[PDB]
């Protein structure tokens, strides 16, 4: 069974899954301290519920919210929006790219204990347990990021929950991450090398898929094409089209690696960790929000001749095998 | 009136005040997410209540907890410990040295609105209003720290609540802060240049005092000594004696600026923002905790011939004048 913000669910219940999403991208404590940054907490909830409901109508049954403590994960927000939209949400532990001093001063042993608290006991005082461990690196894995990766591996080995990575910009990084994970004895089948759609290096992608890593092609709608006069949009969303990103899905299928593909949007319904009003920029690029994958990408890939059964295995079977805890 | 974590109090109720203290030095959300780092939340509360009751029995009536959002300020923790210890606690807004992306991506106008929120409306959903604005600088003041200082000056000018600064480094950080605050139209009498005991540069401190700034001599027990095999120690503590720090208090009094002096410990009862068990290092050096000022420093100054009324001016009158919201 898989832990969600509404409690444990069976594999059969998981359904069509978006494996890399966010309700809100923020900072620890920030939503609670300055909700008016988002208009109000109520407005944010409304926007998230509407948008998750549209994804539900398009067939989405589960999302994995890979916001960590330092991304401002508010598991009570997740629970309220999950219940109202009636969509499963898997919450995360781990460490992203903005750890405060209380996190980045910690040892690998301490970080391991923190991840285990969140997986085995619960997040804060809620009893809601994390279903995945999220880590993030910047180009060259820093000494601290390597501690985070080792603790993630150790916590995955103790609990069976999988690890999902943020690979910054387009600098790849999967091979450096995989080296550390394997030095800890972690199976590649418990790891998703995320944001792998940021690169067109098919040799790089295929070699990781061949080792049994899951490949996250998970920022599919992000594109700043047409927004070249907005430097912050280009930096965040890139200059490649969504079709370019989506065609990597086809490319890995064609190389025989359909079982290794996880697809998502990396969307959110509010964001404070970047420039002010950036949510409006994203919303103008992709009005479909989290429904972008079932509404646009799935038909696109059918139109390129990929069988329905193959797309169902990528959107249903792969996420379930990935999320089901496995020692 | 002055806002505390238990509501408004009158100036006469403030009493002997420690104007630069912390219940817990942490990071936003961290006490909620990992209370077992401190043993438990219950263990932290119990230690803080004992430490504050000890301070109260030594004469303290109010502390100013200058923990910002990014220092993990938990006003519910402060309210609980204040009620149990019967010691007033004034809470802070502002930005310290560890702003997350959601804070450090913000404009001066945005940070002004955030500080105003915490002073005028309340912190989080608690209704507890900040009574001071805390800012921190390093070196010669970074562009972001300058933005924070200006937002602080603007929030001070709109509300009358004072500003207290963390002055780090050896670049006479007080003068850079004063120039920025004065460019905004902020009165020096609304500003405490904190951690001014970190230097022995008396001419520098006197000159600031003469301009009307309050001088925070507020890390007196962090002087250390005896902890040479501890690197984290003298990197965060200091290599001076507490008596030499305390003699700056007398030096400024003798120059004629007793009413410009604020004295404190910069203590806490838990800390997660540095090395693990740094709390144990601190407690070993200063077992008096927040009672160090009244138990050690006030007797030391009395022995050096500073009169009662002068000591009461520094510990009761100066903090009341500083904290009372004043648009001048
Ligand atoms: Zn990411
Ligand atoms: Zn993401
Ligand atoms: Zn300080
Ligand atoms: Zn302090």
XYZ file of C-alpha atoms and ligand atoms in Angstrom:
659
model
C 0.000 0.000 0.000
C 0.935 3.659 -0.649
C 0.651 6.508 1.893
C -1.386 9.539 0.708
C -2.463 12.656 2.558
C -5.832 10.895 3.208
C -4.226 7.667 4.437
C -3.066 4.403 2.820
C -4.427 3.278 -0.537
C -4.000 0.131 -2.603
C -2.091 -0.089 -5.878
C -5.328 -0.656 -7.711
C -6.660 2.655 -6.355
C -3.702 4.748 -7.610
C -4.799 4.975 -11.231
C -3.589 7.526 -13.733
C -0.725 9.277 -11.863
C 1.158 12.534 -12.333
C 4.497 11.698 -10.636
C 6.002 15.223 -10.281
C 3.661 18.007 -9.268
C 3.187 20.758 -6.661
C 0.197 22.329 -5.017
C 2.362 25.339 -4.063
C 6.048 26.078 -4.500
C 7.136 28.136 -1.510
C 9.410 28.119 1.557
C 8.918 26.501 5.020
C 6.419 28.441 7.105
C 5.847 31.036 4.379
C 2.254 30.227 3.476
C 1.364 30.432 7.175
C 3.313 33.708 7.726
C 2.194 35.629 4.624
C -0.865 34.014 3.020
C -1.786 37.355 1.415
C 1.202 36.872 -0.893
C -1.113 34.352 -2.653
C -4.112 36.654 -2.325
C -5.236 34.519 0.591
C -4.942 30.893 1.774
C -8.599 30.539 0.744
C -7.947 31.793 -2.785
C -5.036 29.395 -3.155
C -7.168 26.466 -1.990
C -9.914 27.464 -4.427
C -7.488 27.702 -7.350
C -5.861 24.354 -6.519
C -9.201 22.588 -6.067
C -10.511 23.888 -9.404
C -7.341 22.920 -11.171
C -7.097 19.450 -9.631
C -10.774 18.899 -10.447
C -10.056 19.674 -14.125
C -7.207 17.177 -14.037
C -9.569 14.636 -12.451
C -12.117 15.176 -15.200
C -9.338 14.506 -17.735
C -8.616 11.230 -16.013
C -6.000 11.975 -13.359
C -6.513 9.962 -10.159
C -3.254 10.555 -8.219
C -0.573 13.237 -8.084
C 2.714 13.051 -6.306
C 3.442 16.430 -4.615
C 7.216 16.468 -4.482
C 7.445 19.616 -2.394
C 9.835 19.125 0.497
C 10.034 20.957 3.863
C 12.228 23.624 2.253
C 9.859 24.038 -0.691
C 7.237 25.083 1.846
C 5.245 21.825 1.803
C 2.100 22.404 3.875
C 0.630 18.950 4.333
C -2.585 20.413 5.750
C -3.014 22.377 2.491
C -2.378 19.144 0.569
C -4.972 17.275 2.641
C -7.652 19.998 2.221
C -7.166 20.185 -1.549
C -6.952 16.379 -1.968
C -10.242 15.872 -0.127
C -12.110 18.625 -1.941
C -10.886 17.699 -5.401
C -11.132 14.014 -4.496
C -7.751 13.232 -6.061
C -5.063 11.206 -4.251
C -1.944 13.209 -3.243
C 1.320 11.556 -2.242
C 3.449 13.774 -0.055
C 7.197 13.987 0.063
C 10.098 14.187 2.427
C 13.703 15.117 1.444
C 15.623 18.316 0.736
C 15.364 20.594 -2.262
C 17.661 23.489 -3.249
C 16.827 25.955 -0.431
C 17.605 24.258 2.867
C 17.642 26.639 5.814
C 20.514 26.508 8.282
C 18.670 23.995 10.532
C 18.746 21.499 7.614
C 22.046 22.289 5.908
C 24.072 22.110 9.141
C 22.932 18.483 9.649
C 24.891 15.264 9.184
C 23.992 12.344 6.910
C 22.828 10.458 10.006
C 20.655 13.306 11.151
C 19.123 13.809 7.703
C 18.408 10.083 7.551
C 16.527 10.341 10.853
C 14.526 13.348 9.631
C 13.464 11.562 6.410
C 12.517 8.472 8.418
C 10.444 10.576 10.829
C 8.420 11.936 7.941
C 7.973 8.520 6.313
C 7.476 6.330 9.371
C 5.887 8.624 11.972
C 4.353 11.490 10.025
C 4.860 15.082 8.854
C 4.763 17.645 11.709
C 1.950 16.714 14.111
C -0.422 15.495 11.390
C 0.244 11.749 11.207
C 0.380 12.138 7.397
C 3.317 10.061 6.170
C 5.488 10.773 3.148
C 5.291 8.371 0.212
C 8.434 9.526 -1.600
C 11.833 11.141 -0.876
C 12.727 14.203 -3.028
C 16.322 15.359 -3.509
C 17.841 18.045 -5.708
C 21.312 18.765 -7.042
C 23.049 21.630 -8.775
C 25.335 20.754 -11.684
C 28.237 19.448 -9.677
C 26.795 17.593 -6.660
C 27.920 19.668 -3.642
C 29.224 18.017 -0.455
C 25.966 18.831 1.288
C 23.864 17.516 -1.636
C 25.843 14.277 -1.474
C 24.923 13.931 2.216
C 21.257 14.452 1.167
C 21.531 11.736 -1.523
C 23.125 9.226 0.850
C 20.499 9.872 3.522
C 17.791 9.502 0.868
C 19.237 6.152 -0.193
C 19.466 5.000 3.426
C 15.885 6.018 4.168
C 14.652 4.331 0.963
C 16.505 1.111 1.956
C 14.888 1.096 5.399
C 11.326 1.815 4.218
C 10.985 0.818 0.557
C 9.755 4.261 -0.491
C 11.321 5.602 -3.740
C 13.559 8.591 -4.384
C 12.916 11.266 -6.970
C 15.535 13.823 -8.102
C 15.604 17.414 -9.403
C 18.344 17.773 -11.920
C 18.999 21.508 -12.169
C 18.652 23.547 -15.368
C 19.728 21.172 -18.124
C 23.098 20.100 -16.736
C 21.993 16.446 -16.637
C 23.507 15.096 -13.435
C 21.904 11.680 -13.482
C 25.196 9.870 -13.753
C 26.702 11.664 -10.758
C 23.502 10.986 -8.743
C 23.360 7.351 -9.760
C 26.977 6.784 -8.670
C 26.172 7.939 -5.148
C 22.902 6.012 -4.924
C 24.590 2.816 -6.071
C 27.502 3.291 -3.663
C 24.846 3.063 -0.934
C 23.368 -0.126 -2.360
C 20.155 1.462 -3.594
C 18.423 -0.254 -6.512
C 17.971 1.962 -9.628
C 14.333 0.692 -9.704
C 13.696 2.861 -6.607
C 14.985 6.041 -8.249
C 13.501 8.526 -10.695
C 16.018 10.830 -12.381
C 13.715 13.791 -12.744
C 13.550 16.657 -15.203
C 15.304 14.437 -17.708
C 13.216 16.108 -20.401
C 15.461 19.188 -20.019
C 18.053 17.573 -22.266
C 17.895 16.100 -25.790
C 20.822 13.791 -25.057
C 19.150 10.500 -25.931
C 22.405 8.540 -25.282
C 22.462 9.847 -21.723
C 18.741 9.013 -21.234
C 18.897 5.591 -22.750
C 21.936 4.510 -20.712
C 20.215 5.425 -17.446
C 17.003 3.650 -18.563
C 19.085 0.570 -19.401
C 20.388 0.452 -15.826
C 16.783 0.295 -14.525
C 16.404 3.994 -13.470
C 13.027 5.587 -13.956
C 13.303 8.547 -16.267
C 11.225 11.566 -15.361
C 10.006 13.408 -18.418
C 8.141 15.674 -16.218
C 8.219 19.369 -17.197
C 6.437 18.773 -20.464
C 4.397 22.022 -20.667
C 7.243 24.289 -19.662
C 8.327 26.504 -22.490
C 9.165 30.165 -22.738
C 8.951 30.150 -26.547
C 7.223 33.410 -27.411
C 8.317 34.962 -24.124
C 11.885 35.772 -25.116
C 11.449 39.305 -23.734
C 10.941 37.818 -20.275
C 14.307 36.638 -18.955
C 12.833 35.085 -15.838
C 10.458 32.958 -17.959
C 13.318 31.637 -20.083
C 15.389 30.777 -17.055
C 12.531 28.856 -15.435
C 10.836 27.190 -18.438
C 13.496 26.913 -21.119
C 13.472 27.547 -24.874
C 12.331 24.098 -26.013
C 8.731 23.389 -27.033
C 6.465 21.006 -25.220
C 6.408 18.834 -28.344
C 10.195 18.597 -28.239
C 9.975 17.446 -24.647
C 7.074 15.049 -25.412
C 8.990 13.446 -28.322
C 11.546 12.157 -25.815
C 8.748 10.014 -24.499
C 8.388 8.517 -27.996
C 12.149 8.205 -28.334
C 12.548 6.129 -25.163
C 9.512 3.949 -26.141
C 11.162 3.331 -29.510
C 14.380 2.226 -27.820
C 12.374 -0.322 -25.836
C 12.315 1.485 -22.476
C 8.593 2.129 -22.047
C 8.679 0.579 -18.556
C 11.183 3.213 -17.410
C 9.242 6.352 -18.325
C 7.358 8.606 -15.834
C 5.526 11.622 -17.225
C 4.355 14.783 -15.428
C 3.912 18.557 -15.717
C 5.837 19.993 -12.739
C 2.939 22.371 -12.327
C 1.628 24.290 -9.310
C -1.233 26.541 -8.262
C 0.885 29.132 -6.451
C 4.589 29.977 -6.316
C 6.479 32.305 -4.000
C 9.988 30.933 -4.318
C 10.596 32.791 -7.605
C 9.746 36.212 -9.074
C 6.507 37.943 -8.077
C 3.396 36.958 -10.181
C 5.310 34.195 -11.971
C 2.188 32.047 -11.573
C 0.458 34.330 -14.105
C 3.269 33.757 -16.626
C 2.978 29.985 -16.247
C -0.792 30.087 -16.402
C -0.674 31.984 -19.716
C 1.679 29.357 -21.199
C -0.374 26.360 -20.014
C -4.032 27.102 -19.134
C -4.604 23.331 -18.949
C -2.460 23.223 -15.822
C -2.044 19.659 -14.519
C -4.574 18.378 -17.157
C -1.935 19.163 -19.817
C -0.575 15.584 -19.785
C -3.887 13.677 -20.377
C -5.447 16.413 -22.566
C -2.573 17.272 -24.900
C 0.390 14.952 -24.490
C -1.478 11.672 -24.559
C -3.308 12.532 -27.838
C -0.062 13.858 -29.373
C 1.684 10.576 -28.687
C -1.315 8.529 -30.019
C -1.151 10.701 -33.129
C 2.551 9.731 -33.505
C 1.458 6.097 -33.494
C 2.122 5.028 -29.921
C -0.449 2.405 -28.893
C -3.000 3.251 -26.195
C -1.838 0.243 -24.173
C 1.690 1.628 -24.083
C 0.430 5.022 -22.850
C -1.674 3.361 -20.210
C 1.368 1.431 -19.020
C 3.386 4.680 -18.748
C 0.627 6.642 -16.913
C -0.781 3.866 -14.723
C 1.464 0.856 -14.434
C 4.863 2.547 -14.168
C 3.831 4.955 -11.347
C 2.229 2.227 -9.355
C 5.296 -0.024 -9.572
C 7.464 2.979 -8.719
C 5.410 4.162 -5.678
C 4.578 0.779 -4.140
C 7.094 0.393 -1.335
C 9.627 -2.294 -2.193
C 12.642 -3.162 -0.082
C 1.266 50.601 25.002
C 3.708 47.880 23.852
C 2.564 44.699 22.148
C 3.622 41.385 23.699
C 2.840 37.789 22.956
C 0.089 37.967 25.646
C -1.306 41.247 24.337
C -0.769 44.941 24.994
C 0.902 46.174 28.152
C 1.600 49.621 29.534
C 5.045 51.169 29.647
C 5.103 50.991 33.434
C 4.592 47.181 33.295
C 7.671 46.555 31.161
C 10.168 46.809 33.998
C 13.717 45.387 33.833
C 14.103 44.353 30.208
C 16.546 42.173 28.288
C 16.270 43.751 24.799
C 18.118 41.108 22.758
C 17.230 37.468 23.547
C 15.794 34.329 21.898
C 13.681 31.452 23.233
C 14.925 29.265 20.327
C 17.278 29.964 17.408
C 16.049 27.881 14.508
C 14.587 28.091 11.008
C 11.048 28.702 9.805
C 8.847 25.645 10.298
C 11.663 23.584 11.757
C 10.376 23.275 15.337
C 7.039 22.032 13.913
C 8.710 19.605 11.459
C 11.413 18.129 13.698
C 10.726 18.859 17.377
C 12.804 15.783 18.348
C 15.857 17.718 17.316
C 15.326 19.513 20.681
C 14.404 16.324 22.516
C 10.796 17.311 22.160
C 8.749 20.476 22.018
C 7.783 19.636 25.615
C 11.415 19.433 26.669
C 12.187 22.818 25.008
C 9.222 24.487 26.729
C 10.244 23.081 30.098
C 13.869 24.273 29.746
C 12.729 27.721 28.544
C 10.226 28.124 31.359
C 12.852 27.218 33.951
C 15.348 29.607 32.377
C 12.867 32.456 32.224
C 11.668 31.857 35.790
C 15.357 32.011 36.826
C 15.746 35.314 35.002
C 12.535 36.635 36.625
C 13.795 35.723 40.102
C 16.910 37.783 39.279
C 14.732 40.776 38.493
C 13.877 40.472 34.786
C 10.292 41.367 33.821
C 10.428 41.516 30.006
C 12.563 40.076 27.235
C 12.550 41.020 23.579
C 12.786 37.880 21.475
C 14.460 39.149 18.358
C 13.880 35.918 16.399
C 12.547 36.680 12.939
C 10.552 34.438 10.623
C 13.802 33.043 9.205
C 15.198 32.404 12.676
C 12.266 30.081 13.201
C 10.263 32.349 15.474
C 7.310 30.370 16.860
C 5.031 32.874 18.611
C 2.877 30.097 20.004
C 5.974 28.784 21.777
C 6.740 32.294 23.012
C 3.182 32.787 24.268
C 3.227 29.462 26.119
C 6.572 30.103 27.807
C 5.667 33.750 28.607
C 2.440 32.677 30.374
C 4.130 29.897 32.350
C 7.139 32.009 33.409
C 5.182 35.258 33.964
C 7.740 37.175 31.921
C 6.594 39.475 29.127
C 7.956 38.628 25.710
C 8.013 41.099 22.822
C 8.079 39.415 19.416
C 9.922 40.491 16.265
C 9.402 40.894 12.583
C 12.186 41.529 10.103
C 14.821 39.396 8.320
C 17.928 37.838 9.779
C 20.767 36.089 7.909
C 18.996 33.026 6.546
C 16.070 34.253 4.364
C 14.520 31.495 2.224
C 13.849 32.125 -1.449
C 10.283 33.358 -0.709
C 11.793 36.173 1.311
C 15.042 36.945 -0.520
C 13.329 37.218 -3.939
C 11.163 40.006 -2.559
C 11.304 43.740 -3.361
C 11.714 46.508 -0.779
C 7.978 47.289 -1.197
C 7.037 43.665 -0.613
C 9.246 43.321 2.494
C 7.727 46.546 3.838
C 4.246 45.039 3.445
C 5.373 41.831 5.192
C 6.795 43.689 8.162
C 3.708 45.839 8.339
C 1.517 42.700 8.278
C 3.370 41.283 11.288
C 3.237 44.564 13.220
C -0.252 45.850 12.389
C -2.301 42.682 11.814
C -0.442 39.893 13.581
C 1.929 36.965 13.100
C 0.523 34.017 11.200
C -3.072 33.435 12.397
C -2.365 34.252 16.009
C -3.212 37.951 16.384
C 0.111 38.441 18.154
C 1.728 41.612 16.876
C 5.441 42.254 16.522
C 6.829 45.015 18.756
C 10.241 45.343 17.139
C 11.806 44.970 13.682
C 15.025 42.896 13.512
C 17.564 43.228 10.656
C 21.015 41.780 10.115
C 23.998 42.821 8.078
C 27.352 41.315 7.228
C 30.492 42.975 5.938
C 29.732 46.297 4.251
C 25.984 45.485 3.715
C 24.876 43.390 0.781
C 22.300 44.615 -1.756
C 19.621 42.394 -0.230
C 20.501 43.484 3.359
C 20.158 47.096 2.177
C 16.678 46.353 0.837
C 15.812 44.819 4.240
C 17.151 47.903 6.128
C 15.105 50.241 3.987
C 11.918 48.155 4.352
C 12.567 48.146 8.116
C 12.967 51.946 8.194
C 9.693 52.326 6.255
C 7.809 49.963 8.521
C 9.211 51.769 11.555
C 8.179 55.172 10.169
C 4.603 53.848 9.573
C 4.156 52.218 13.043
C 6.673 53.777 15.469
C 8.130 50.404 16.453
C 11.924 50.410 16.769
C 14.607 48.572 14.756
C 17.351 46.415 16.213
C 20.299 45.181 14.148
C 22.661 42.195 14.120
C 26.013 43.748 13.280
C 28.509 41.114 12.125
C 32.056 41.419 10.772
C 34.780 44.004 11.345
C 33.774 46.644 8.778
C 32.330 49.024 11.434
C 28.918 47.854 10.268
C 27.123 50.446 12.389
C 28.185 53.309 10.159
C 26.906 51.682 6.959
C 23.571 50.870 8.690
C 23.233 54.417 10.088
C 23.791 55.965 6.634
C 21.059 53.819 5.100
C 18.576 54.372 7.976
C 19.203 58.127 7.909
C 18.708 58.264 4.094
C 15.177 56.919 4.716
C 14.393 59.627 7.281
C 14.519 57.272 10.278
C 15.426 58.826 13.639
C 18.566 57.267 15.230
C 16.549 57.066 18.511
C 14.468 54.291 16.869
C 17.560 52.173 16.185
C 19.693 49.873 18.299
C 23.022 48.971 16.707
C 23.310 45.474 18.128
C 26.307 43.256 19.056
C 28.299 46.445 19.515
C 30.192 44.684 22.363
C 31.942 42.556 19.704
C 34.443 45.385 19.204
C 36.817 47.216 21.549
C 36.678 50.254 19.253
C 35.316 52.733 21.805
C 35.680 55.828 19.583
C 33.399 54.150 16.991
C 30.729 53.397 19.603
C 30.832 56.829 21.207
C 30.384 58.525 17.850
C 27.283 56.452 17.113
C 25.908 57.221 20.612
C 26.482 60.917 20.053
C 24.337 60.700 16.889
C 21.449 59.366 18.975
C 21.701 55.609 18.174
C 21.113 53.075 20.933
C 24.124 50.871 21.406
C 23.447 47.226 22.031
C 25.991 45.678 24.354
C 24.129 42.426 24.129
C 26.447 39.432 23.763
C 28.261 39.886 27.086
C 28.331 36.172 28.142
C 29.451 34.965 24.687
C 33.025 36.050 25.379
C 34.049 32.417 26.194
C 37.774 31.600 26.858
C 38.983 28.095 27.794
C 37.476 26.500 24.683
C 40.507 26.549 22.328
C 40.129 22.930 21.152
C 36.594 23.900 20.104
C 36.649 25.591 16.680
C 32.896 26.222 16.440
C 33.194 27.864 19.862
C 35.472 30.878 19.272
C 34.038 31.229 15.748
C 30.589 31.881 17.255
C 31.525 32.963 20.839
C 34.582 35.223 20.943
C 38.102 35.253 22.447
C 37.586 38.109 24.898
C 36.549 38.149 28.557
C 33.035 39.097 29.573
C 34.439 41.649 31.959
C 36.183 43.514 29.137
C 32.855 43.611 27.301
C 31.077 44.803 30.433
C 33.624 47.604 30.811
C 32.325 49.107 27.553
C 29.100 49.740 29.431
C 31.062 51.758 32.014
C 33.127 53.478 29.294
C 29.975 54.777 27.553
C 28.415 55.858 30.871
C 31.577 57.799 31.681
C 31.384 59.516 28.284
C 27.886 60.767 29.165
C 25.761 58.345 27.140
C 24.133 56.097 29.745
C 20.759 56.719 28.127
C 22.074 55.301 24.837
C 22.940 51.903 26.287
C 20.995 48.624 25.988
C 22.364 45.506 27.664
C 21.431 41.863 27.057
C 22.748 38.254 26.800
C 21.679 37.132 23.327
C 20.869 33.813 24.943
C 18.491 31.002 23.995
C 17.194 27.693 25.301
C 17.489 25.755 22.065
C 19.453 26.176 18.852
C 19.280 24.251 15.587
C 20.777 26.800 13.186
C 24.366 25.870 13.995
C 26.298 22.695 14.873
C 24.452 19.967 16.773
C 24.641 20.337 20.559
C 26.050 23.898 20.296
C 23.445 24.512 22.994
C 25.553 22.326 25.301
C 28.679 24.355 24.475
C 26.831 27.572 25.323
C 25.300 26.225 28.526
C 28.750 25.037 29.675
C 30.238 28.538 29.245
C 27.312 30.439 30.717
C 25.284 28.332 33.121
C 23.471 31.497 34.300
C 21.653 31.736 30.966
C 19.558 34.898 30.663
C 20.216 35.592 34.375
C 23.818 36.378 33.499
C 23.156 40.099 33.069
C 21.451 40.638 36.450
C 23.571 38.117 38.404
C 27.033 38.953 37.048
C 27.094 42.124 34.988
C 25.001 44.397 37.254
C 27.048 43.463 40.349
C 30.285 43.959 38.395
C 29.250 47.477 37.353
C 28.100 48.293 40.938
C 31.498 47.187 42.227
C 33.163 49.522 39.645
C 31.153 52.336 41.174
C 28.185 52.730 38.880
C 25.269 53.931 40.985
C 21.919 52.173 41.348
C 19.931 54.858 39.519
C 22.243 54.642 36.508
C 21.861 50.863 36.366
C 18.070 51.243 36.631
C 18.207 53.820 33.816
C 19.976 51.328 31.525
C 17.839 48.308 32.375
C 14.361 49.852 32.866
C 14.191 53.354 31.460
C 16.153 52.988 28.239
C 14.250 49.856 27.097
C 10.880 51.425 27.851
C 11.777 54.573 25.826
C 13.073 52.375 23.017
C 10.122 50.010 22.803
C 7.299 52.531 23.228
C 5.969 53.107 19.685
C 7.054 56.634 18.795
C 6.675 58.505 15.508
C 8.782 61.191 17.285
Zn 12.293 20.228 -9.791
Zn 9.066 20.220 -9.055
Zn 22.436 38.589 16.317
Zn 20.370 37.359 18.587
